[PDB]
Amino acid sequence: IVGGYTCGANTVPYQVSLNSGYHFCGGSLINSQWVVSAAHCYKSGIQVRLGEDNINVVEGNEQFISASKSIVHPSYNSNTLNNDIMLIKLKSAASLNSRVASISLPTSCASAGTQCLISGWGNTKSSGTSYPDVLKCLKAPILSDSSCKSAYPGQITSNMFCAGYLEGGKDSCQGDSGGPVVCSGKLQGIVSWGSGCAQKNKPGVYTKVCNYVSWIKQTIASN
Ligand SMILES: N=C(N)c1ccc(/N=N/Nc2ccc(C(=N)N)cc2)cc1
Numbered sequence: 001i002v003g004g005y006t007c008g009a010n011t012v013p014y015q016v017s018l019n020s021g022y023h024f025c026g027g028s029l030i031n032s033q034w035v036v037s038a039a040h041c042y043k044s045g046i047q048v049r050l051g052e053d054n055i056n057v058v059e060g061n062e063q064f065i066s067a068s069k070s071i072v073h074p075s076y077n078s079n080t081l082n083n084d085i086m087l088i089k090l091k092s093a094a095s096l097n098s099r100v101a102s103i104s105l106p107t108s109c110a111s112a113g114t115q116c117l118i119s120g121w122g123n124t125k126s127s128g129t130s131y132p133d134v135l136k137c138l139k140a141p142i143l144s145d146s147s148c149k150s151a152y153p154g155q156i157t158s159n160m161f162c163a164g165y166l167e168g169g170k171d172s173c174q175g176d177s178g179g180p181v182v183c184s185g186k187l188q189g190i191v192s193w194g195s196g197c198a199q200k201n202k203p204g205v206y207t208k209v210c211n212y213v214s215w216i217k218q219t220i221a222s223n
Pocket residue numbers: 040078079081171172173174175176177191192193194195196197198202203204205
């Protein structure tokens with residue numbers, strides 16, 4: 001997260017770190033057994049790390065639970081990043097309370113203008129690289145589809161939305177991928193892609209979670 005702020009330990013209780021020997025992506029806990037992340041975060045041998053603030057220090061609220069399976073969206077296209085969504089099932093149910101909590105799936109797609117909270121342990125620099133230890137947060141509005149498409153001609157599908165700031169300076173970034181965009185207490189987005197980070201007129205592009213609720217629910221119901 002570029003131009004964000006330190007969330008505060010466990011203030012984003014549904015934020016998970018996907019770990020394969022190191023943090024490589026974010027994810028969002030959507031029930032005790034399931035995490036939503038970006039399909040482009042897919043890899044085998046994922047350990048989901050919940051309860052985590054400083055990802056480099058055991059601070060006492062972590063739950064580390066290996067994935068038992070991952071399910072990449074049937075229509076995920078890694079070239080276009082269309083349908084950049086996956087589900088990761090935990091081998092065991094996470095223990096839920098205030099510091100580790102699922103985030104509700106949306107009942108309806110959020111609108112351009114809605115403020116959201118985007119979070120992750122990704123790069124905090126637009127130029128060069130600095131990875132934070134602790135979870136970073138960014139409040140960012142959903143951008144209109146038109147501005148999103150204008151920013152990224154020929155690239156924005158109905159399964160994507162832009163959020164952030166056209167002026168740049170504030171954005172998700174590499175390592176935030178797969179993490180949440182939560183708006184009004186609902187997971188509306190998944191950190192998906194963008195051209196660099198916090199660049200002018202290159203806002204973050206997010207998987208439009210509301211499009212996937214049926215798929216998420218039915219997948220969970222049968223897996
Ligand atoms: N909001 C941003 N600017 C932004 C946020 C996250 C981000 N990271 N994604 N990285 C990323 C890495 C690999 C793939 C792939 N295997 N095809 C896709 C995307 C890149 C840009």
